[PDB]
Amino acid sequence: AQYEDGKQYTTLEKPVAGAPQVLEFFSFFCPHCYQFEEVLHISDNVKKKLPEGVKMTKYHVNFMGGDLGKDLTQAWAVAMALGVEDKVTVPLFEGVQKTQTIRSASDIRDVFINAGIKGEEYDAAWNSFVVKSLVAQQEKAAADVQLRGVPAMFVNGKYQLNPQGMDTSNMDVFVQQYADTVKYLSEK
Template sequence: MNKFWLALIGLVLSYGVSAANYAEGTEFIKIEKAVQNAPRVVEFFSFYCPHCYQFESIYHVSQTVAKNLPKDIKMERYHVDFLGPLGAELTKAWTVAMVLKVEDKVSPLLFERIQKTESINTPPDIKGVFIKAGVKSEQYDAALNSFVVKSLVLKQQQAVEEFQLRRVPAIFVNGKYMIRNNGITIEDVNNYAKAYSDVVNFLISK
């Protein structure tokens, strides 16, 4: 059991509860002002955030939530600018990954090189990760400077403002519910991702 991670998210280790017992203020909160036209499920994260690194790479919450969603719903993942010296550049790079559909290849590499080896210090370092993931240099440059990437970057930045986001990782459902990362009740820490996913699916239909 990773005590460091438990300290960060404050997991509640207890007997599991049924969906009927999910309660506002425990597993989730209802935000004061609902965000119109938001994705049904959206996660905000940063490659500079150690919580986000463990959220994805150790406990696989992001992957589990996405995999267990109803077939007609896709989870969007938005990067935030407000952490780290290259926060804005990483948002652009993440958007390139979205457009080129290489998120699964790029995300682990970016997390590892920022969280573990601390080897990303310049925009060319970021580009190098894409090249290692199999993206050609000219393909990366073309996407980075494309209208669609610029539009999606703006969309992510606007969403951060609309949700009045101050910390990550954060997952919102239906534009009005936020999962409380430290409110998920579990018996075994290894079941955290599945329990988290169950709360998301409960809120989708709420």
């Protein structure tokens, strides 16, 4: 075949029922995730090739960066609740990995303030049970697939993308192969 289990993807031995169609996992501490967001724009290029009626979910994980890692998962919950993902993703990545100006929850908060979310609104979100259950969702979804590594993408809770088995000589070719694989798995 041209798409083979074990080459552009692997199959989950234990499929996850009721899982989001396209489920992607990242960490702001994760160097390939930085690449995936700012250099490759994976999420975006996958979207562009996905059918219609298909939903994309992106979750943060706890297992990198200890205490700050967990703060970042809660902050991403806040981002999802307020719908400001597209205004904080880049400054969070750059604050963690480029400038290294994010060292505490207060520093994470500054990123949001600077992005124009109001202080009051962020703190209220931060402390809300809606954000608590959204943190729970992030953890549960990660637990559902025994996640030990990011970046990761899962399609319909049964197939996991395998970027190691794609050519990396050309970054644009890598992205299209990645996106075309998601589409193929989608239609499976």
